[PDB]
Design a protein around this ligand. Structure first.
Ligand SMILES: N/C(=N\O)NC[C@H](N)C(=O)O
Ligand SMILES: N/C(=N\O)NC[C@H](N)C(=O)O
Ligand SMILES: N/C(=N\O)NC[C@H](N)C(=O)O
Ligand SMILES: [Mn+2]
Ligand SMILES: [Mn+2]
Ligand SMILES: [Mn+2]
Ligand SMILES: [Mn+2]
Ligand SMILES: [Mn+2]
Ligand SMILES: [Mn+2]
Lengths: 314, 314, 314
């Protein structure tokens, strides 16, 4: 199977500058070379060039709506094209707002896809329920069908078409959810596994459930949108919004090892890695390495080890 | 429901100076303001003034028996008064010796209450079985009925009346128990979940069992005495007696999240936070924030989020 | 039961200098005195003096084959002697290559012994499958019967006799296994619990299984070869080959507490503690203290506590 890496150096989804550098650090860490060592054909598409929308006035509270809307429109086009060609897309991004376009494009070719969102946050705030007009916290709100029309139209997002419903998304790693978002997830009946459920059940059972919930009836393409802040700050410190009590390194790789085994991974996003937020060079290296580790795990690398087929090492 | 915060700046329960500053730090961290943001009515009773007993000679090996006996007798009076008024008491303390009065006062109004003791220690040493006359390590010994008369009367504690039996107390987090204490818990048949049981079962099953054990037959008021050293030193470093291999921040909140859900929390003690034992300002901030976190969790804050009733955020 | 501590200050099993100092640090930490406080008879045999083989040319890729072959031949003799006298041997080592002699000696007196290998690595590379001639990574390859003759004879190891088969060894903590090793463990059908299995099952079930697997049919002597790098670098940082995502302190002690309970522990190795690899004095203290902790756990110390028999502490 073919893999296509698409760089999304975008940062207008949030305050902190630096996330746009995420793609370069991931590559510098050898992400592409390491991927080629797996059983997949790896093509690197390179980073997308985002045209800055001049005079991008804030829509009420939402900031840089046009720059964010246009950047995502371009990514969706690119992701649609590669999905079309039967490849698995891998979006290396800046902030999580780029999930709008990643999933949108993906849904265009695979409308029956389901989403597994690993994040300490629900990123389901609407333009009206946001304490900060930061779009990297409102991705899911633009994608959900049940949220269509529950908020004014935002400049730059008219091209967006609600592609997934509340029954096609599973959250894993919740621990910092705003009141509005919590009202929305409870009201819409969305399935989630906050840290309390991870502690209660154990990551093993959590994965078991998330899958029977999403794949039981029909087997369908899986889109994994991974917010690096889903892990505890001790593992992925160089991120804009760290939250203590996160998932551990082990649990993160478990998640990715299990998603790899289903053979259904069709889309992937590795977001919020901000190379400039590392208090020490080591904190950035730690974060980058872990993100690379998770990506490789999604594509075969097993902690129990790997060996090439048809090769007699004896 | 009403909540009453009662500060117990006492430190004669142990050798290390500083725990008496515990209450001030917890408040400085915004404990009271944050509590008010919950669905409970919050009233701060302020800190109690403890009259120092002059010429407090040590009873054999027990140190400051009179200062400790009188400080507790006073707290018990205060806690009994607030419980009487139908409020949930919250004791912010110095050392754990103050549990004698917290639980005693509580038991006066709710004689059928059960106790969940989160501690790396059993604190069940008797005046005769202590290697150190430190009273912060003998609280349970004064409260247990089965231990009544198994040790000489100590100056300043004649007012104490054994209010709970070995079947009404559950320990969680044990890992540093003295021989005498271990002889006592095994002999008395006390129920406990040391770290080995937490590892074996997982915190989820642990909570499940501690409730069927204490609540299976009758539903009764729950008293949670929380020794901060129950969590691992990596989480609550600023404490007088840290023990490696402790409960994690996640497990701590789980315990508190589950105790909140029962709707039975009737009394609470957040002890051993010693603001002066932090090797770095960060180590004290860490400890204080975690203690505050656990308290807020005991009263509703869920990691999955919370939203106000009757409010349509859309 | 008697315990015999045998120091193996050897370091030619790998490139990093310092592991030979492991035994001295372990003793300095009070390992011997603390052991004496247990219910076992403790005898310190002292450290062995290893005669350096001059002009020890590398066998193809394998380095210091003769120095390593002779050092182990001597240890095996010593371990055989003590096992003979009905004592439990405890090898405080440098690098893990010394497991060749520890287990070999042990097997001579107890041929039906089984092995539980806690390591982040499989240390089952053969002289032909190593990327470095480092012998600390090839111990199991010299001990396995199914690997006999699958590699050339190495200078200094002719005395070695394959004493255990693929069905008598269980690995716990795997996460860094080379392709050749992974081919070998899969091909030979060896039983293992890599970190993914630990995350999936939980350490509790893992131990349960390792025992029914190795002890289900017959009860036999247990040999525990503990590579300190089996625990996460956060716990045992002072080691030559640290690997993130390891077993936790808690899980380490669980393993040792469970092995103690079987009453079958017959041989033990506490390897790879390198006092010179600690970035800070604290990192070395941490590592040394944990290694001592695990050892004491193997011999009785329970986290729930301990009390001497026939003694009425009341
Ligand atoms: N970090 C983050 N999401 O990823 N924060 C979400 C928070 N609700 C906000 O609206 O800004
Ligand atoms: N820290 C602590 N309990 O909380 N230590 C208990 C120890 N048994 C002592 O008797 O002093
Ligand atoms: N550290 C370690 N084993 O313990 N490394 C094993 C690695 N296969 C090597 O062959 O050097
Ligand atoms: Mn996030
Ligand atoms: Mn996010
Ligand atoms: Mn304690
Ligand atoms: Mn205590
Ligand atoms: Mn190793
Ligand atoms: Mn090893």
């Amino acid at each position: 199977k073919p893999i296509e890496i698409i760089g999304a150096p975008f940062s207008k989804g949030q305050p902190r500058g630096g996330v746009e550098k995420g793609p370069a650090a991931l590559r510098k860490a050898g992400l592409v070379e390491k991927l080629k060592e797996t059983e997949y054909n790896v093509r690197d598409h390179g980073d997308l060039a985002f045209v800055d929308v001049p005079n991008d006035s804030p829509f009420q509270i939402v900031k840089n709506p046009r720059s964010v809307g246009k950047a995502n429109e371009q990514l969706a086009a690119v992701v649609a094209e590669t999905q079309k060609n039967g490849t698995i897309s891998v979006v290396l991004g800046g902030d999580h707002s780029m999930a709008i376009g990643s999933i949108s494009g993906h849904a265009r070719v695979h409308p029956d896809l389901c989403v597994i969102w690993v994040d300490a946050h629900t990123d389901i705030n609407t333009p009206l329920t946001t304490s900060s007009g930061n779009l990297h916290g409102q991705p899911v709100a633009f994608l959900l069908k049940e949220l269509k029309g529950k908020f004014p139209d935002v400049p730059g997002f008219s091209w967006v078409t609600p592609c997934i419903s509340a029954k096609d998304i599973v959250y894993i790693g919740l621990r910092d959810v705003d009141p509005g978002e919590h009202y929305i997830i409870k009201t819409l009946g969305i399935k989630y596994f906050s840290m309390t459920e991870v502690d209660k059940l154990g990551i093993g059972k959590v994965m078991e459930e998330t899958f029977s919930y999403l794949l039981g009836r029909k087997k369908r393409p899986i889109h994994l949108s991974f917010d690096v802040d889903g892990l505890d700050p001790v593992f992925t410190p160089a991120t804009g919004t760290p939250v203590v009590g996160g998932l551990s390194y082990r649990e993160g790789l478990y998640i990715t090892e299990e998603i790899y085994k289903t053979g259904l991974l069709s889309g992937l996003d590795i977001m919020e890695v901000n190379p400039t937020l590392g208090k020490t060079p080591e904190e950035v290296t730690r974060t980058v390495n872990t993100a690379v580790a998770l990506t490789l795990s999604c594509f075969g690398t097993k902690r129990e080890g790997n060996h090439k087929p048809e090769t007699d090492y004896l």
